[PDB]
Amino acid sequence: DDSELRNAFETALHEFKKYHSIEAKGYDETYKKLIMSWYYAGYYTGLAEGLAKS
Amino acid sequence: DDSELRNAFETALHEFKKYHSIEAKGYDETYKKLIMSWYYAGYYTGLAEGLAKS
Amino acid sequence: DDSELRNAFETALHEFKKYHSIEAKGYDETYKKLIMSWYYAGYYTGLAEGLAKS
Amino acid sequence: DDSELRNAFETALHEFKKYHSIEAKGYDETYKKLIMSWYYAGYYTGLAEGLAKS
């Protein structure tokens, strides 16, 4: 009956939210690489400056 | 004339747009400081390692 | 004959040339990582700004 | 006497080292532009990629 369509809709709704949660996961890993990249840029910057004072 | 009183509306309308988005601005500043902090942790870690080698 | 023993000299002479210039090679690798690090800091900074605009 | 020549030589020696210190200054600024250029190449690369995901 019309119950099968409503059940199908909740399924498609579950897949929709499951998809955006993956999208959010991707944005999270992106911002972690952003932070590490700034850490290493500072590290090799400081390291070169330190070797020069030799 | 109208120009004086009209700007007083856009002026007030401006400060109220700021107020409505102070939290979002706070998250933004929080993440800028996060990024600068990790840069600097890296900087001073690399510097110290570079000075030690001499 | 001579070919076998002669190559053993150039072979050993090679590894010892490497040893004599490991520090200079270290400075070189340090500066390659410095360059890649700043590229990546820029990459992820620009990406995040580009995603935010949507 | 021969003291004037030795004094003249130390002067010319001072100018010689003062010149190479400028040369070293030029090599330094060159490597800073090298690093910034890689930063901006990454930045505009990331930024374009970010706008595309729109």
UniProtKB/Swiss-Prot annotation, chains A, B, C, D:
Changing S37D: Abolishes homooligomerization beyond homodimer formation and results in abnormal SMN complex formation. Decreases vegetative cell population growth. It is found in: Nucleus. Residues 37-54 are annotated as: May interact with gem8. Changing Y43C: Localizes in the cytoplasm. Disruption phenotype: Degron-mediated knockdown leads to decreased cellular levels of Sm-class snRNPs, abnormal splicing of a subset of introns, and cell population growth defects. Signal peptide: none annotated. Disulfide bonds: none annotated. InterPro entries: Smn1 (IPR040424), SMN_C (IPR047313). The SMN complex catalyzes the assembly of small nuclear ribonucleoproteins (snRNPs), the building blocks of the spliceosome, and thereby plays an important role in the splicing of cellular pre-mRNAs. Most spliceosomal snRNPs contain a common set of Sm proteins smb1, smd1, smd2, smd3, sme1, smf1 and smg1 that assemble in a heptameric protein ring on the Sm site of the small nuclear RNA to form the core snRNP (Sm core). Belongs to the SMN family. Homooligomer; may form homodimers and homotetramers. Part of the core SMN complex at least composed of smn1, yip11/gem2, gem6, gem7 and gem8. Part of the SMN-Sm complex. Interacts with yip11/gem2; the interaction is direct. Interacts with gem8; the interaction is direct. Interacts with proteins of the Sm complex, including smn1, smb1, smd1, smd2 and smd3. This is SMN complex subunit smn1. It comes from Schizosaccharomyces pombe (strain 972 / ATCC 24843) (Fission yeast). The gene is smn1.
